[PDB]
Paper text:
PDZD8 is an ER anchored lipid transfer protein containing a lipid-binding module of the synaptotagmin-like mitochondrial-lipid-binding (SMP) domain family. PDZD8 consists of an N-terminal transmembrane helix, a SMP domain, a PDZ domain, a C1 domain, and the C-terminal coiled-coil domain. PDZD8 tethers the ER to late endosomes and lysosomes by associating its C-terminal coiled-coil (CC) with the LE Rab7. The GTP-loaded Rab7A (hereafter referred to as Rab7) on the LEs recruits various effectors facilitating endosome transport along microtubule tracks and their fusion with lysosomes and autophagosomes.
The structure of the PDZD8 CC–Rab7 complex was determined at 2.1 Å resolution by molecular replacement method using a structure of the GTP-bound Rab7. In the asymmetric unit of the crystal, there were two molecules of Rab7 bound to a single molecule of the PDZD8 CC. The PDZD8 CC forms a coiled-coil structure within a single polypeptide chain and does not have intermolecular coiled-coil interaction. The three α-helices form a flat structure arranged in an α1-α3-α2 topology. Two Rab7 molecules (Rab7a-A and Rab7a-B) bind on the opposite sides of the flat CC structure and have no direct contact with each other. Two Rab7 molecules loaded with GTP have an active closed conformation of switch I and II loops. The direct recognition of the PDZD8 CC on the closed conformation of switch loops explains the GTP-dependent interaction of PDZD8 and Rab7. The MBP-PDZD8 CC bound two GTP-loaded Rab7 molecules with Kd values of 0.67 and 11.1 μM, respectively. The asymmetric bivalent binding of Rab7 and the membrane anchoring by Rab7 impose a constraint in the orientation of the PDZD8 CC–Rab7 complex, positioning the coiled-coil domain parallel to the membrane surface.
Numbering used by the authors:
A (entry chain A): 7 to 177
B (entry chain C): 999 to 1104
C (entry chain B): 6 to 178
């Protein structure tokens, strides 16, 4: 029983930092752009059983994307990340979610498992408010919403525990 | 931004394969020399990625600022080829990373 | 400063690693050090007046099981096909190496993509593949150049890679 989770969202929002904080318990300040994709593996406990979670990090920058359509068809759960200090990254969430649904073409697209992370809450002068993001998540079939900091490991463990539960729904 | 659709893009199996083979990279060498050679390769690969990524960024800046359709079309083909080189280099780095991760699971 | 990416292909043992090391490092190992580990070397070369950077990729290892050409060949400007003139079976597989590259790298104009063929180990003074034979195969493959080489004695090594550089440069923007 293997769970395939993919992380999507604009470049710079913290997709790689969130994956590395959850699996490796480490965080780095310096930016290394993700080219193409990579995955890490983690055993996670759901209910009292170990399932293997395969967490796919992907390129936010369009010119560095290389994954084919067949790849997205096997995703069990899709994580949407934005930056609470960068409202354009919240604005584009619709196009990430919709384009993924077109390529994944799940059998019941409107109940596909998404989880949304609002990252970098450790920064001052956040420009997207919690209720505003919550309103959006509610409107999209009430998908779970976590506010996270990869830099300070706020809600990282809690978010991925929900991601794993949602991925099992599909599987 | 958006999720590019690429009909013959990469599949799961390529990443799984570079990791499976990379796990046994330089197996046979003493556990001392093995981790030496792997660190050397990851450092060399990062420097090469950095170099290429700086050339890539320079091509991006210049394509944004060009009005001449001919020179834009040439910049786009160079940026595409830079992108392909970066994909290969990144998959090579993932290959050698699996060697490191093999040492530290043991 | 143009960067030229060169893939070297061919059966295990023909001398791929040794041809690269002899061109780039001017060193040869008599010892058989089989390629564990994809790697590339870099060398500045002057092509008629232009100084260019050549990256020479040595990706193949013990057995072909690796689909790793899908990962590593992309972006190449030239592909070097190497066989051992003392082992006719290494010449027999050239078609499959050339086709492998064309399928897994998907170059923009497959029928004009620069290939170069090196028949290696002429110093072993045992020639089981005749010079005319390799040239006939090469001619039929859209007239690609053939070089007989020795990585051990540095026979034709500098000459082969100068032509590799030129032909890699020729098909670009
Ligand atoms: N302050 C703060 N910085 C973060 C946080 N998460 C990531 N960063 C930093 O933000 C920058 C971008 O982070 P990445 O994880 O590389 O972003 P990414 O989403 O993977 O970007 P791409 O690979 O281009 O798609 C890096 O410099 C990180 O150090 C966070 O929660 N708080
Ligand atoms: N006599 C002679 N021996 C050579 C020559 N070139 C390579 N060799 C020897 O042939 C053996 C194979 O050399 P490699 O360069 O590792 O061959 P390779 O094509 O990279 O293939 P793998 O070893 O399987 O990775 C080694 O013992 C070399 O010393 C040559 O030009 N003349
Ligand atoms: Mg990233
Ligand atoms: Mg070799």
């Amino acid at each position: 029983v293997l769970l395939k989770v993919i992380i999507l969202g604009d470049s710079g929002v913290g997709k790689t930092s969130l994956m590395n904080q959850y699996v490796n318990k480490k965080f780095s300040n310096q930016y290394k752009a993700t080219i193409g994709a990579d995955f890490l593996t983690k055993e996670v406990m759901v209910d009292d059983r170990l399932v293997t979670m395969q967490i796919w990090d992907t390129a936010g920058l369009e010119r560095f994307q290389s994954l084919g359509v067949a790849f997205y068809r096997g995703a069990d759960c899709c994580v949407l990340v934005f930056d609470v200090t960068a409202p354009n990254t919240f604005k584009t969430l619709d196009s990430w979610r919709d384009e993924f649904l077109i390529q994944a073409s799940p059998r019941d697209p409107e109940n596909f498992p998404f989880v949304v992370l609002g990252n970098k809450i450790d920064l001052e002068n956040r420009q997207v408010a919690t209720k505003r993001a919550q309103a959006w998540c509610y409107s999209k079939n009430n998908i779970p919403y976590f506010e996270t900091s990869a830099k300070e490991a706020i809600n990282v463990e809690q978010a991925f525990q929900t991601i794993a539960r949602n991925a099992l729904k599909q599987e | 931004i958006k999720l590019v659709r690429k009909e013959g893009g990469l599949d799961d199996s390529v990443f799984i394969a570079v990791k499976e083979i990379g796990r046994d990279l330089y197996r046979g060498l003493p556990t001392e020399e093995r981790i030496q050679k792997l660190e050397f390769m990851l450092d060399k690969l990062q420097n090469e990625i950095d170099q290429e990524l700086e050339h890539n960024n320079s091509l991006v800046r210049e394509e944004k600022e060009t009005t001449d359709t001919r020179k834009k079309s040439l910049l786009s083909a160079a940026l595409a080829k830079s992108g392909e080189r970066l994909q290969a280099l990144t998959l090579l780095m993932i290959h050698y990373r699996a060697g490191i991760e093999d040492i530290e699971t043991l």
